[PDB]
Amino acid sequence: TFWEISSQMLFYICKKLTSHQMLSSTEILKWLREILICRNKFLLKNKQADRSSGTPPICRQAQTKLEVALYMFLWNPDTEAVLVAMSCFRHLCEEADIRCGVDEVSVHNLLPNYNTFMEFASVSNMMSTGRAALQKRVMALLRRIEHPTAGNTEAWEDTHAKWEQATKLILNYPTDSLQEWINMTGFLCALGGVCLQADTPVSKFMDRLLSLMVCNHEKVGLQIRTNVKDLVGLELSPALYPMLFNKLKNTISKFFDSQGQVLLTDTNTQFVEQTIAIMKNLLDNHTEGSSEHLGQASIETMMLNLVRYVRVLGNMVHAIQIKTKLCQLVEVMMARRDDLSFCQEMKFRNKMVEYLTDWVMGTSNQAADDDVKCLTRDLDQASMEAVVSLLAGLPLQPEEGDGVELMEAKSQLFLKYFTLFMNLLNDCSEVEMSRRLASLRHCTVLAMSNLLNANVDSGLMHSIGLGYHKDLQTRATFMEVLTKILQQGTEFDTLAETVLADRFERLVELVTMMGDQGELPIAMALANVVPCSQWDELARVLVTLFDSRHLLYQLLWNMFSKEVELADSMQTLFRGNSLASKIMTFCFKVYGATYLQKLLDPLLRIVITSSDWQHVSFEVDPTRLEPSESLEENQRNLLQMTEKFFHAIISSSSEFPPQLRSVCHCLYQATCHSLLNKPQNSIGAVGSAMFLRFINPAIVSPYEAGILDKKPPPRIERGLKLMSKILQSIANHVLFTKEEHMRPFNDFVKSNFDAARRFFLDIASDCPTSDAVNHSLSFISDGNVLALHRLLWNNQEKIGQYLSSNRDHKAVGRRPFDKMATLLAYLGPPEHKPVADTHWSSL
Amino acid sequence: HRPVEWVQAVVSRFDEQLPIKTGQQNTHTKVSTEHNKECLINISKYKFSLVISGLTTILKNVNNMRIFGEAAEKNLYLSQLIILDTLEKCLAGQPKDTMRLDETMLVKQLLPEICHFLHTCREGNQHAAELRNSASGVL
Amino acid sequence: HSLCTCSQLHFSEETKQVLRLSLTEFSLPKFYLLFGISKVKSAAVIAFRSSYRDRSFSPGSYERETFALTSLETVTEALLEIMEACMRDIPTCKWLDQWTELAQRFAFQYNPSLQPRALVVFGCISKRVSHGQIKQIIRILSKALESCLKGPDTYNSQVLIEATVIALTKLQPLLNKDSPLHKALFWVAVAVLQLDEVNLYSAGTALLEQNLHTLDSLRIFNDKSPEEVFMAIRNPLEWHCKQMDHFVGLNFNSNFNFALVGHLLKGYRHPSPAIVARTVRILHTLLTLVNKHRNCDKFEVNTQSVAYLAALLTVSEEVRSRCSLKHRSNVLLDEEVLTDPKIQALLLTVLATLVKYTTDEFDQRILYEYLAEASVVFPKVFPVVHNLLDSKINTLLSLCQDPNLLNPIHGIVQSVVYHEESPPQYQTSYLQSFGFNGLWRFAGPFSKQTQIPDYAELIVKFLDALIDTYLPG
Ligand SMILES: [Zn+2]
């Protein structure tokens, strides 16, 4: 009776809170916090006495309307309610722990977002601050919700309807309401990823959001355009970028009529001026989780249309201000060039050097004869800074379609740009603002360096005359470029293995420095200070490097040990987002992919194609069973298949990759030591984690892992999914309970608890150090080193500070940190990455 | 010698946090001033004459001062409410060892101030109602 | 650059890699700072001038940075490293002997402008030292003090005291293994920490951190304690020492361990963060040697080790956990072992001195919790500490608004009144009864006005007697 009566009360009250605002809403929230606490205590007491814990349909239909009300309070204007509502989230986590003690899969199955909910409570334990400061913390948390549910998906759709009605009253009718509107919009932008997947309600939010960007309202218009630009640039969820870039492009493509003639309308100018500010913020900050989404879509055709529109605005105080900001966006766009996707990068970078070199007209302000036209000086500075960044490692390409031959066409093209920079260089002479000319002259000499560095054959002849220039500082720079060219071989010449093989030999020995007690100061220091956005790059470089030196165990022992001991989650923590987890993903995905293909390929061919299995079903659910299906017939077939798959895995111990045995051993040791400092078995957790994170996903979905060419038939798809549960239970050393469907198999799983353990023993019984098995190949791995030398250089300052604090007993006068500065300065700045020849791709 | 001065400091900080005394936000969400009260209460168990005699003079000044304005009056009603609530706990928590050693003080220092509230008061319908309840418990 | 590309010399390929790497270090902004030309983009541009044949340059910016003898060591040791690498490939090379002779000729002669620098160089490139030389270095230190107090030209000779102490740091490890001076040089480090100057205090510790380190490699503390080793060698000249204790106010015959910690407490006030960490290491090192003599796990609380554990309280996480307050393994302030009234009065004075000068929220929190706890555990002797707590508490009661820092303070007030009404058994002048009346003064901040305390006349006589006793001739 208690669970039926108590939940019905909760259903009624939780429906009124979301119905509409009330004066006393904040008070009902505090009372509601305590009702939940009492419900937890009774459940704990009842569970101890008898596990039984009834869950009628009303229990689930009221457990959901509660989450639909704890989200919708996160944008309440009152700061008091929002701080309370975050606290209540903790009680949902606790009630899940009591209902199921298996934190491995039960906790993360009843409450899919368990991990992030624990972070909501911690934030609430912070000093109270203003509304703006707090909202920028709520959003960051909302951006981390991953899995759709009924609470996430209905909260977004419920508050959207409220958002769509507030807008009409603000606009259609000609400050308190305006602050509520600003909160709702930030809510939908940050928590829109869940509701993603034509006419879906998410794609209608975007449409309405690109009409307010050009809102011309007499009274409030200004504030709407300003907040929309701020929210859509800084707070949007990364999972929505592809839907944005693809919607801004289709809005700008209508400003050009047939034959490509622009159409100035005084509102297209306002739209094309917000887009630049949105794209400048959205690109100029690094947000976690955007790596896989930023590079999914191309923005080439949108950027070309932006320069080709502003090109026609003309000369004025306003037009010259738009041109300056467009040049600053291009400079940021070239800083993120390794996270974007290009269909033709060489022609794109060539076709914008052509456009932006037409605004670099010099002496315009003197000819302008106006004092307000000092801006045109700033435009030259902006355009040259952009052009320098576009020419770094850029081969010149003449736009084809003309009779002139390729070699002769490139030479005429180099001369065009060279003579342009020389003319600009002469006008910056001191005789012909002592700071403005100093900067602009520095850039022009740094753009001829890049043009020549990449086109030595095409344009060395036109440049030899720079050695007798009238400016002694220009002759010095030109004679340092000629020095670099001479030291680089004209072609490969098989000189990489000789000329450069020993150049970086000292670099790798520095990072692999076996710091006393095996601490690896450089590697560990590098981990902390690198930005999170670059954690994918760091995992690949570190793992590849150390393994090539036969020290992979050393890196891992220092990497997993910290998190396992730091957090009681131990193995569980390696499945979130953190550097220690990304090293795990890399090892499985690169070293284990071939292990699975040679294992599951022959077996899946049998069941999928063999005649014996032409007409079979693996449906053992009586409720779902069809009238013609026979339960006895279905059960026997499913059991036989599990014998084939399970048997094959056990016999494949010898072929287990060497790279993965070290990973398994570290967990065995790290977990074993974890118990030491605190009847649990070490091998129990290693095997369970290995099965759930490595093998099970491959079996369940072999097509989406590349083991198969086409999706399996639905019949076989069901069979594989059920077999996974049986295989998982054997590893966990558990039997079937509460699921009468699978109970008949509890005899088969029990008989296999022994054989499974022996298998886990073989892989995890390798020595902590590979003394028995040793070899020395010592791969040069030239292409990997250049990535390392590029990563160290960009983080020189931060890496130095971190190392200085530690190693106190022995000063840093000759500690690794002092060796790094000497070696980095000796090697010099890293080269420029070459243009990309494919679309963006990841691991 | 020295510690005597320490007691005065705790007593003195009690005065400068009464609402009628200018509120300088030293309350710090009232947690800081809340701690000062409880520490003052505990000291009474060992220095009964000093703490009590300190509180009569604090109360004697608050009563005998002039204020104008509706906002100012609400403070005076609120400040005196705190003094009596605190003054009663000092008496209530004293060990019951028949510590009847205050003959001089009461006759001319404390009583002529408590009797002031108990007079039938027509200044306020509600304000005087709660004070007379508070002053009766002390007497 | 000339050594690398010289033909008359045949350096192996290993050596040439060393010279090329040194050639790059000297161009870093670290070395530009040692040579005194920071704020300069390129040194070559400033060295030359294009119009040297036309006009004469006019010097400007007469302000010139001060040169520190610690910078000369870094330069003098990077150059010594270069020379040695070359001497390996040159048989019967005489480069280092010739450089050594030039250094001597200037170190041991009176010159205000060259002797300080030559002394530092001499102690860095020397491979041997005899008793006679170690005698002359101390005699220079003796005279530098004498001249310093006589006249106002103090800074001139305060540098000659710094270079002498720096040299003794570099030369002691080369002394004879059985010389008596390995121990007598401990009383020179202490006598240099009593002069109250940041530069003399910084150089004094470096001679003490290594003096302990050297004595271990000779295994002198294997079967003894620091109090016995250093106090035995002080016995012959106790008459002069007995007067230095009286003025400084820290008796070494009463409680050696608390007297020594009375000198190392001022190191928390040093402006340089790198010297505060050095004094923390010395405290760890002295704790290990005293317990090992007792075989007491290096963290046990006893009469010998209580002093060092009080000082490390606010810096070391391990000490707090291993010695935690009872009313939350063992616990500090144990009344079963800390029974003597004296030893429980020198522990509270240390705890009150640290708070008086500390100005960190976190540090004050931890210390006031132990003082509050100590009020109930040592009611009799607590009132010998009121003055060190009087002023700062008075302000804290009024203006503080931190609940974390306010609860422990209120505990102290509640405990003084409760235990009052008893006649004062121990007064505030109890410590002066047996010497330690200067513990709370010596640990104060360094004085801006760099003036010799004027009892240095006693130190000069003390050193003079030291030479005669152990270096008769
Ligand atoms: Zn494409």
Q: SS in 3 state form for A155-174?
A: HHHHHHHHHHHHHHHHHCCC
For B32, which of C390, C394, C406 is closest by C-beta distance?
Answer: C406
Do you know the residue count of chain A?
Answer: 843
Instruction: Estimate to the nearest angstrom the gap between the alpha carbon of C378 and the chain centroid.
Output: 33
CA distance A730 to chain C (A): 44
Q: Is A147 exposed, middle or buried (0-12, 13-18, 19+ CB in 10 A)?
A: exposed
**Partners of A256 in beta bridges:** A262
Q: Which amino acid is at C269?
A: R
CA distance C25 to chain A (A): 6
A400 dihedral zone (left: phi>0; alpha: psi -120 to 50; beta): beta
Q: Are C186 and C147 spatial neighbours (Cβ–Cβ below 8 Å)?
A: no
Place of tokens 């760890």: C284
Q: Tell me how far apart the alpha carbons of residues A592 and A586 are, in angstroms, rounded to a whole number.
A: 9
Q: What are phi and psi of C323, to 5 degrees?
A: -130, 90
Number of Cβ pairs < 8 A linking chain B and chain C: 50
Q: What are phi and psi of C204, to 5 degrees?
A: -65, -40
Q: Are A209 and A240 spatial neighbours (Cβ–Cβ below 8 Å)?
A: no
Q: What tokens were used for A188?
A: 């939908």
Q: Does C407 contact chain B (CB < 8 Å)?
A: yes
Q: What are phi and psi of A262, to 5 degrees?
A: -65, 160
Q: Is the dihedral of CA C388, C390, C394, C395 positive or negative?
A: negative
Q: How far is CA C12 from CA A313, C3, C16, C18, in A?
A: 69, 13, 7, 10
Q: Tell me how far apart the alpha carbons of residues A786 and A781 are, in angstroms, rounded to a whole number.
A: 9
Q: How far is CA C43 from CA A450, A825, C27, C36, in A?
A: 28, 17, 9, 11
Q: Please work out, in degrees rounded to the nearest 5, the angle formed at the alpha carbon of residue A107 by the alpha carbons of A105 and A108.
A: 65
CA distance C236 to chain B (A): 45
Do you know the residue count of chain B?
Answer: 139
Structure method: cryo-EM
Q: Are A311 and A323 spatial neighbours (Cβ–Cβ below 8 Å)?
A: no
**Closest among C464, C383, C361 to C141, alpha carbons compared:** C464
**Closest among A240, A252, A296, A293 to A276, alpha carbons compared:** A252
Q: Please work out, in degrees rounded to the nearest 5, the angle formed at the alpha carbon of residue C269 by the alpha carbons of C268 and C272.
A: 90
In angstroms, this model's resolution equals 3.3
Q: Does B95 contact chain C (CB < 8 Å)?
A: no
Q: How far is CA A59 from CA A63, A68, A117, A562, C400, in A?
A: 6, 15, 21, 41, 51
Q: Tell me how far apart the alpha carbons of residues A122 and A594 are, in angstroms, rounded to a whole number.
A: 42
- Around Cβ A385, how many Cβ atoms within 10 Å? 18
CB contact under 8 A, B6 and C418: no
Residues whose CB is less than 8 angstroms from the CB of residue B109 and which lie 6 or more positions away in sequence, other chains included: B53, B56
SS3 helix, strand, coil % of chain B, rounded to 5?
70, 0, 30
Q: Running DSSP on this structure, what letter comes out for residue B64?
A: S
Contact list in B for residue C401 (CB cut-off 8 A) is 26, 28, 32
Q: Are A588 and A692 spatial neighbours (Cβ–Cβ below 8 Å)?
A: no
Contact list in C for residue B12 (CB cut-off 8 A) is 398
In A319-363, alpha helices (H): 319-335, 345-356
Q: Max alpha carbon distance in chain C (Å)?
A: 92
Q: What tokens were used for A163?
A: 């958002």
Chains near C with 3+ CB pairs less than 8 A apart are A, B
CB contact under 8 A, A809 and C281: yes
Q: What are phi and psi of A257, to 5 degrees?
A: -75, 175
Q: Are C385 and C349 spatial neighbours (Cβ–Cβ below 8 Å)?
A: yes
Q: What tokens were used for A125?
A: 């334990």
CA count, 13 A, side-chain hemisphere, A55: 7
Q: Does C272 contact chain A (CB < 8 Å)?
A: no
Per residue, the 3-state secondary structure of chain C, as one string, reads: CCCCCCCCCCCCHHHHHHHHHHHHHCCCHHHHHHCCCCCCCCHHHHHCCCCCCCCCCCCCCCCCCCCCHHHHHHHHHHHHHHHHHHHHCCCCCCHHHHHHHHHHHHHCCCCCCCHHHHHHHHHHHCCCCCHHHHHHHHHHHHHHHHHHHHCCCHHHHHHHHHHHHHHHHHHHHHCCCCCCHHHHCHHHHHHHHCCCCHHHHHHHHHHHHHHHHHHHHCCCCCCCCHHHHHHHHCHHHHHHHHHHHHHHCCCCCCCHHHHHHHHHHHHHHCCCHHHHHHHHHHHHHHHHHHHHCCCCCCCCCCCCCHHHHHHHHHCCHHHHHHECCCCCCECCCCCCCCCCCCCCCHHHHHHHHHHHHCCCHHHHHHHHHHHHHHHHHCCCCHHHHHHHHHHHHHHHHHHCCCHHHHHHHHHHHHHHHHHCCCCCCCCCCCHHHHCCCCHHHHCCCCCCCCCCCCCHHHHHHHHHHHHHHHCCC
Q: Is the dihedral of CA A798, A804, A805, A807 positive or negative?
A: positive
Helix pair angle (A796-805, A521-529), 10° resolution: 120
For A826, which of C24, C30, C277 is closest by C-beta distance?
Answer: C24
Pairing of strands A256-257, A261-262: antiparallel
Q: How far is CA C148 from CA A237, C110, C111, in A?
A: 72, 15, 15
Q: What tokens were used for A683?
A: 């091998």
Q: Nearest residue of A to residue C285 by CA position?
A: A809
Contact list in A for residue C21 (CB cut-off 8 A) is 822, 826
Best to test chain C binding among A472, A510, A806, A808 (most C CBs inside 10 Å): A808
Q: Tell me how far apart the alpha carbons of residues B40 and B51 are, in angstroms, rounded to a whole number.
A: 8
CB contact under 8 A, C74 and A813: yes
Q: Tell me how far apart the alpha carbons of residues C314 and C320 are, in angstroms, rounded to a whole number.
A: 8
Q: Is A221 exposed, middle or buried (0-12, 13-18, 19+ CB in 10 A)?
A: middle
Q: Are A58 and A5 spatial neighbours (Cβ–Cβ below 8 Å)?
A: no
Please tell me the distance between residue A408's alpha carbon and the centre of ligand 1 in angstroms: 30
Q: What tokens were used for A527?
A: 């981990």
CB contact under 8 A, A809 and C28: no
Question: In sequence order, what DSSP letters do the residues of A299-331 get, joined into one string?
Answer: -HHHHHHHHHHHTTS-SSTTHHHHHHHHHHHHH
Q: Tell me how far apart the alpha carbons of residues C440 and C352 are, in angstroms, rounded to a whole number.
A: 9
**Closest among A40, A98, A296 to A840, alpha carbons compared:** A296
Interface residue ranges in chain A relative to chain C, Cβ cutoff 8 Å? 808-809, 813, 821-822, 825-826
Peptide-bond breaks in chain B following residues (C–N over 2.5 A): none
Please tell me the distance between residue A540's alpha carbon and the centre of ligand 1 in angstroms: 26
**Closest among C456, C435, C466 to C197, alpha carbons compared:** C456
Q: Please work out, in degrees rounded to the nearest 5, the angle formed at the alpha carbon of residue A9 by the alpha carbons of A8 and A11.
A: 65
Please tell me the distance between residue A289's alpha carbon and the centre of ligand 1 in angstroms: 23
Q: Which amino acid is at C212?
A: L
Contact list in B for residue C399 (CB cut-off 8 A) is 26
Per residue, the 3-state secondary structure of A571-597, as one string, reads: HHHHHCCCHHHHHHHHHHHHHCHHHHH
Contact list in C for residue B31 (CB cut-off 8 A) is 403
Q: How far is CA C472 from CA A14, C135, C173, in A?
A: 97, 10, 22
Contact list in C for residue A826 (CB cut-off 8 A) is 21, 24
Q: Tell me how far apart the alpha carbons of residues A164 and A180 are, in angstroms, rounded to a whole number.
A: 13
**Closest among A825, A832, A773 to A800, alpha carbons compared:** A825
Q: Does B139 contact chain C (CB < 8 Å)?
A: no
CB contact under 8 A, B47 and C417: yes
Peptide-bond breaks in chain A following residues (C–N over 2.5 A): 52, 174, 197, 432, 678
CA distance C285 to chain B (A): 39
Q: Max alpha carbon distance in chain B (Å)?
A: 49
CB contact under 8 A, B13 and C393: no
Please tell me the distance between residue A413's alpha carbon and the centre of ligand 1 in angstroms: 27
DSSP-based three-state secondary structure for B121: coil
Q: Tell me how far apart the alpha carbons of residues A283 and B84 are, in angstroms, rounded to a whole number.
A: 64
Q: What tokens were used for A547?
A: 């393994």
Residues whose CB is less than 8 angstroms from the CB of residue A775 and which lie 6 or more positions away in sequence, other chains included: A550
Q: Tell me how far apart the alpha carbons of residues C187 and C138 are, in angstroms, rounded to a whole number.
A: 12
CA distance C24 to chain A (A): 7
Q: What tokens were used for A49?
A: 């006495």
| Cα radius of gyration (chain B) | 15
- Around Cβ A783, how many Cβ atoms within 10 Å? 9
Instruction: Estimate to the nearest angstrom the gap between the alpha carbon of A276 and the chain centroid.
Output: 23
